[PDB]
Amino acid sequence: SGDYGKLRDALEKLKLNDAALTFEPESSTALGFGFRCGFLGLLHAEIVQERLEREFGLSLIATAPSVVYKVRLKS
Amino acid sequence: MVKIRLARFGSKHNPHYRIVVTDARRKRDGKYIEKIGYYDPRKTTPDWLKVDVERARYWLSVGAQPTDTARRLLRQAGVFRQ
Amino acid sequence: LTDPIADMLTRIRNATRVYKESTDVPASRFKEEILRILAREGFIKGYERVDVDGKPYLRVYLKYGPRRQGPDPRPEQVIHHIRRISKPGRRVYVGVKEIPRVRRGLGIAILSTSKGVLTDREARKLGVGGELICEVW
Amino acid sequence: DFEEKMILIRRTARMQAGGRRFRFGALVVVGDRQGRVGLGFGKAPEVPLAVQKAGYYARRNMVEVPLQNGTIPHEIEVEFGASKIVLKPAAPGTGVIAGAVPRAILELAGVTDILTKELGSRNPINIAYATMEALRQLRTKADVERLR
Amino acid sequence: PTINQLVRKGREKVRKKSKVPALKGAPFRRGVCTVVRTVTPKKPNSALRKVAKVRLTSGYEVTAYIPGEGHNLQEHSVVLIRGGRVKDLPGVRYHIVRGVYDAAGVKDRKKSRSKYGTKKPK
Amino acid sequence: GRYIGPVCRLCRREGVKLYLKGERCYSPKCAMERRPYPPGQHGQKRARRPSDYAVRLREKQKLRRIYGISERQFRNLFEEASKKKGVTGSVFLGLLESRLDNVVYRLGFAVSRRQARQLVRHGHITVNGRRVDLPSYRVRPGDEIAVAEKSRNLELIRQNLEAMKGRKVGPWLSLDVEGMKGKFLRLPDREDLALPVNEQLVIEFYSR
Amino acid sequence: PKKVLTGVVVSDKMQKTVTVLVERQFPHPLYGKVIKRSKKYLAHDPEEKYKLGDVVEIIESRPISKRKRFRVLRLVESGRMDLVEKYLIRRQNYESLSK
RNA sequence: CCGAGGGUAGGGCCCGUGACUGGGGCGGUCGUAACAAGGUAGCUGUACCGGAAGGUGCGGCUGGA
RNA sequence: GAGGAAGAAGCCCUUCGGGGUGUAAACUCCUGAACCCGGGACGAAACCCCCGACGAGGGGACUGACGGUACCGGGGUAAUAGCGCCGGCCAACUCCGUGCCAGCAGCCGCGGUAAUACGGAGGGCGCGAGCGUUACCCGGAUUCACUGGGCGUAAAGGGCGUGUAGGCGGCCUGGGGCGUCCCAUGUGAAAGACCACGGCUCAACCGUGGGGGAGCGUGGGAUACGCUCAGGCUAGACGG
RNA sequence: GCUAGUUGGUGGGGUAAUGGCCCACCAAGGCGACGACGGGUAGCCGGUCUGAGAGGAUGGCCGGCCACAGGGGCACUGAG
Numbered sequence A: 001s002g003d004y005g006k007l008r009d010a011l012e013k014l015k016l017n018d019a020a021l022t023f024e025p026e027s028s029t030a031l032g033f034g035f036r037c038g039f040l041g042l043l044h045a046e047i048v049q050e051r052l053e054r055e056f057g058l059s060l061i062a063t064a065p066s067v068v069y070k071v072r073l074k075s
Numbered sequence B: 001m002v003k004i005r006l007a008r009f010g011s012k013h014n015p016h017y018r019i020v021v022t023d024a025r026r027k028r029d030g031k032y033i034e035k036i037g038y039y040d041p042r043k044t045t046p047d048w049l050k051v052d053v054e055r056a057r058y059w060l061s062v063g064a065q066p067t068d069t070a071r072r073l074l075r076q077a078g079v080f081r082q
Numbered sequence C: 001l002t003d004p005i006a007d008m009l010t011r012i013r014n015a016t017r018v019y020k021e022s023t024d025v026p027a028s029r030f031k032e033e034i035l036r037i038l039a040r041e042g043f044i045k046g047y048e049r050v051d052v053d054g055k056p057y058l059r060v061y062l063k064y065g066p067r068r069q070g071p072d073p074r075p076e077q078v079i080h081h082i083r084r085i086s087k088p089g090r091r092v093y094v095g096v097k098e099i100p101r102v103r104r105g106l107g108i109a110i111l112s113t114s115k116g117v118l119t120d121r122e123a124r125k126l127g128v129g130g131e132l133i134c135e136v137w
Numbered sequence D: 001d002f003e004e005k006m007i008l009i010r011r012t013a014r015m016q017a018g019g020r021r022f023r024f025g026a027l028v029v030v031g032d033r034q035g036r037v038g039l040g041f042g043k044a045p046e047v048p049l050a051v052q053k054a055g056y057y058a059r060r061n062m063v064e065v066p067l068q069n070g071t072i073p074h075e076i077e078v079e080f081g082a083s084k085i086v087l088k089p090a091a092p093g094t095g096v097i098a099g100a101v102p103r104a105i106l107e108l109a110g111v112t113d114i115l116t117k118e119l120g121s122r123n124p125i126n127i128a129y130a131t132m133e134a135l136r137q138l139r140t141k142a143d144v145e146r147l148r
Numbered sequence E: 001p002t003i004n005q006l007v008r009k010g011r012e013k014v015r016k017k018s019k020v021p022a023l024k025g026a027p028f029r030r031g032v033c034t035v036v037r038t039v040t041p042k043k044p045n046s047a048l049r050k051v052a053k054v055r056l057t058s059g060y061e062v063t064a065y066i067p068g069e070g071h072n073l074q075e076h077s078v079v080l081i082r083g084g085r086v087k088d089l090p091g092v093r094y095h096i097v098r099g100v101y102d103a104a105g106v107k108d109r110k111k112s113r114s115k116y117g118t119k120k121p122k
Numbered sequence F: 001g002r003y004i005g006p007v008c009r010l011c012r013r014e015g016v017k018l019y020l021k022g023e024r025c026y027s028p029k030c031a032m033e034r035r036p037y038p039p040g041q042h043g044q045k046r047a048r049r050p051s052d053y054a055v056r057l058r059e060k061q062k063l064r065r066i067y068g069i070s071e072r073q074f075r076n077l078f079e080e081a082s083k084k085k086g087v088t089g090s091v092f093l094g095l096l097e098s099r100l101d102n103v104v105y106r107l108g109f110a111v112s113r114r115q116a117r118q119l120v121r122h123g124h125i126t127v128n129g130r131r132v133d134l135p136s137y138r139v140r141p142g143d144e145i146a147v148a149e150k151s152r153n154l155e156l157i158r159q160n161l162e163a164m165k166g167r168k169v170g171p172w173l174s175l176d177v178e179g180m181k182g183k184f185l186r187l188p189d190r191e192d193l194a195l196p197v198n199e200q201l202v203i204e205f206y207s208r
Numbered sequence G: 001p002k003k004v005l006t007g008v009v010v011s012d013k014m015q016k017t018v019t020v021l022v023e024r025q026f027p028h029p030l031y032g033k034v035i036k037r038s039k040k041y042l043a044h045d046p047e048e049k050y051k052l053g054d055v056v057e058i059i060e061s062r063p064i065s066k067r068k069r070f071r072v073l074r075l076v077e078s079g080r081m082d083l084v085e086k087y088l089i090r091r092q093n094y095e096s097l098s099k
Numbered sequence H: 001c002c003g004a005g006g007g008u009a010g011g012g013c014c015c016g017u018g019a020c021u022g023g024g025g026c027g028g029u030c031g032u033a034a035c036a037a038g039g040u041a042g043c044u045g046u047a048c049c050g051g052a053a054g055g056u057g058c059g060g061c062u063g064g065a
Numbered sequence I: 001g002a003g004g005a006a007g008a009a010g011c012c013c014u015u016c017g018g019g020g021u022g023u024a025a026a027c028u029c030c031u032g033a034a035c036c037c038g039g040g041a042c043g044a045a046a047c048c049c050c051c052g053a054c055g056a057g058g059g060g061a062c063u064g065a066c067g068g069u070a071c072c073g074g075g076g077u078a079a080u081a082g083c084g085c086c087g088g089c090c091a092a093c094u095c096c097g098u099g100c101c102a103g104c105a106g107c108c109g110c111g112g113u114a115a116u117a118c119g120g121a122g123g124g125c126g127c128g129a130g131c132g133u134u135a136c137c138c139g140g141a142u143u144c145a146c147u148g149g150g151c152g153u154a155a156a157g158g159g160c161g162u163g164u165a166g167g168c169g170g171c172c173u174g175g176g177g178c179g180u181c182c183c184a185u186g187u188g189a190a191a192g193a194c195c196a197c198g199g200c201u202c203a204a205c206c207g208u209g210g211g212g213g214a215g216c217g218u219g220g221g222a223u224a225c226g227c228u229c230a231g232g233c234u235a236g237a238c239g240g
Numbered sequence J: 001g002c003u004a005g006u007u008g009g010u011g012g013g014g015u016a017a018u019g020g021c022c023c024a025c026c027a028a029g030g031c032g033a034c035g036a037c038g039g040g041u042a043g044c045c046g047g048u049c050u051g052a053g054a055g056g057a058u059g060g061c062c063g064g065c066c067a068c069a070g071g072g073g074c075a076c077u078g079a080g
């Protein structure tokens, strides 16, 4: 669907734990109710979802991961 | 039964009782049957005890039963002086 | 004709503002009782029983005031103000404590009581009350 | 030589081709504080012209106002169109309990302790006039008594 | 209406509608930021006006305002809201209270600091 | 608590000497007589027409200031007068005057309203022999007010009283000089006092 | 006292009992004018004696049945069908008030 | 016998929601119905018609000469 | 707290003369919150004991959580001030920054390069161990109008009759006394409110006393008006 | 628009005691626009806040009554 409310809490508890949950809510046409997380290092992110899916059976796919840019549009 | 007792008023660290007829079972500062005098135990004024002897004796008369401190006061207002 | 007492008070009030000397009002005992107080109290000269076209009326004689100076010289009225206070649509009884002191005493309040139609001050004196009829000043 | 106390200065507008045009309205009360007031409402091109003008008219229009001990002698309600003023006598400790216009009349009429309430349309200009011809209808026990 | 009409049909007492239902109906409410943008106001006011959608403990999801010059708010910032409407911004029933929870006071504000939650100067 | 702060500035803002500060008030170097215009930058600039409410405001403030009293205590008294039988402007003025801190000043045990408070506070006054250090104390008629022992012999109270020989304290009191007692006699008449204040506008003020 | 009411018998059709109507006048709490008001009391009549139409007095009594706690004290009029009709009228009028 | 309650079935009112679909309020395209006889006096109940305002019939009103 | 300059510095304004913060500070003096030291409560006088009788009456003794507290006596240090506002309503104005941005806002509305309306500073007003904000109630709102509003054109007369309930109802006399008015009486607890007095240093608080009133039970009286019954009338209405 | 223990009767049962309080028979009644029935909300007063007053709004502390003791039902003991 899938479980936007059930996902968000999962962030909330982890989010209490840590930085790299690390959520500003986001939405894209690939799937509903998708959110952005940045993880200090690649490994945290890989632990956190993994934890999610084995533990809670919220089996999902996460796009990623993002590097941040110094764009200075000519205008 | 029905009794004669000190019902407490006044304020904190400033008592002023209202010696009162009241059924045993009421909370002390609750509806009594009849006020029959007061008793400031600290004595901060001329009048500091004032039984209504007439009524005191009627009540007493028909089997109301004073406390100890309430009996002790009634004395000082002559309730039992024969 | 639902309220002959209003009707009289009205006849009167209407009359005065045009400055008439008299006006006939159909006669009833009760009405004479009001007219009694009204003249005794000075709001009218007085009244008399009479007759028009056969049937009994009541001719009420009208006080006013001296002429005035300036433009618009019409005299002060002695009856300035007169309204009912106990319409049939709404009966108003008042107890002795409650008898209205009208206009600071500059005016009166009639009122049927069981000791008779008195003024407020009479009703206060005898120490009674009842149906507040009207008020004048 | 009385006191006076402007109660309303206001601007207003005409309209000629290629421009609005102005005029001024001053509504001054004038009184000796002893028991004589007089309200005047004058209008002119410039403000103080319109205030002096108001003065003149004012004096040309004074009023009785009986004073049974600093209060008025009997409660009264008059109502110059849509606006209703209600006066009401009071004890000496009271003070003038009044709207800001009808107080400027009462103040200068020498009134000291009274109650008012403005009901109806609360336009100053009206409430002022309503007030003037509401004082004007006061009478003393005597004033009456002679009338009957 | 005649007195009989009054006896018969009474006078109808008034009743009032809350402008502040999300507070439900506490003096303040806590919530979590879902969106945090700027909004343009209606005419004749022009500005880039700071605003936050909020999900209140009361259940409702409402949009509130960020008074003061600059704010450390962003999504998931948990903040409390007080009643208070912005005239320019349609639909902003509430105000976000500075200096509480995830909301920093306006830094370096010297005046009216109890509004805008700024602690007193050294 | 009390005001504490420049008291002169007041008398400019209010526009008259509310005698508030001891001997100086009667100098040629008192603030008023030097520079009788409001404190601050615009102190000298032309006055605007004072608003109706503005008038009533200063008046309320002129009075209160004179007795250096908290606007809470003030209004409380003012309400007492209304509920009291009598002329409210008046009874206000007297309920105000029965203040122990005041009565000390009126007797001239202290030079000033302000000072009176400190005397009363450090229990230098006593009412009816018993000591009192509340400056709010409501002096009844026939209260005997006096310095008591360990301060009768004090550099100050002597000085003020030394200086109290050939002046007559006001009509509603009395003063056993150098014995150092006085008697509240009766509550004053509005016209014994002659403060520059119009008790009526105050009444008017607490109306709006 | 106990309590004395006066009013029209406005039905039997029960055994030992009469529905009695009872008027009361009083002023409007706020609007002052006088209003009348009414209430039926089921009354006791062991001797199915009191017929319709009657104006009777009934008195506070000890419970005789659920909702029947007055006896009839004494007859004081008779044949007041005019009243009874005014009730049967207000009862009849009701089918026009439905939907 | 009754009986808390559990279960079966059929209704009633409410709330939430739903592909889609009406309209409503707030921020370029087509015309130009109303406001001056507004360029066909307007409004109006009603009917039919028309992209859109609206036009037209029947009767009414002046709040139109 | 009293004194203390035609008036320090600093900072603000300026027509570069000067103004302002300001008797404010400094500073001279005396008073002494806090602290230290000493003594130290009322609330507790009964049950008990003695005389007398295990009665009245009289006498005597035990008992304090609060608390080594309040309070008293002595000694004694100048010892926290903050917050809201300053276009109008509404008491309180200047400069600088910003340039329809940033921001302010309850409402008018402010801000597009001289802003008393934004941000800061000086100055000012308010109140002060508080001062503001939000929420909610009454108020202003005679803006549900009993007191105390309205419907030609502002919202508002039913399209028109007929008539059921209900509302209301002319002139005179008499009986009733339901309404209505009056008197007595019972009730209307205490606490609260109000008036007076007294008790804690005042007050808050508390004690004591006083008056309240609607209401409702009972008894007694009144008869104008409203009701009800009875008689009578012809000015309303109907009919020939 | 509502009502079959529903409304009255009789005779029983029960209680400290009146009553369809419960049970059997008997009659067809009882209630409602003076708002029944359904729905919403709420513990009620002394009081309290406001208000010139009428009024409005409110029932925290305290005093009085009521009701409940995790959600329901039942009785036992007993003066209760």
Ligand code: SF4
Pocket: F007, F008, F009, F011, F012, F016, F017, F018, F019, F020, F021, F022, F024, F025, F026, F029, F030, F031, F032, F033
């Ligand atoms: S009177 Fe005393 S206080 Fe008031 S200004 Fe003159 S000097 Fe300063």
Ligand SMILES: [Mg+2]
Pocket: D064
């Ligand atoms: Mg004259």
Ligand SMILES: [Mg+2]
Pocket: D081, D082
């Ligand atoms: Mg009018």
Ligand SMILES: [Mg+2]
Pocket: E043, E044, E045, E046, I100
């Ligand atoms: Mg713009």
Ligand SMILES: [Mg+2]
Pocket: E043, E044
């Ligand atoms: Mg624009």
Ligand SMILES: [Mg+2]
Pocket: E109, E110, E111, E112, E113, E114
């Ligand atoms: Mg600040």
Ligand SMILES: [Mg+2]
Pocket: F207
């Ligand atoms: Mg007031």
Ligand SMILES: [Mg+2]
Pocket: G064, G065
């Ligand atoms: Mg039976």
Ligand SMILES: [Mg+2]
Pocket: none
């Ligand atoms: Mg079952």
Ligand SMILES: [Mg+2]
Pocket: none
């Ligand atoms: Mg079941």
Ligand SMILES: [Mg+2]
Pocket: H005, H006
């Ligand atoms: Mg089960």
Ligand SMILES: [Mg+2]
Pocket: none
């Ligand atoms: Mg839907």
Ligand SMILES: [Mg+2]
Pocket: none
């Ligand atoms: Mg649906």
Ligand SMILES: [Mg+2]
Pocket: H032, H033, H038
């Ligand atoms: Mg056109």
Ligand SMILES: [Mg+2]
Pocket: H033
């Ligand atoms: Mg056209």
Ligand SMILES: [Mg+2]
Pocket: none
């Ligand atoms: Mg046309």
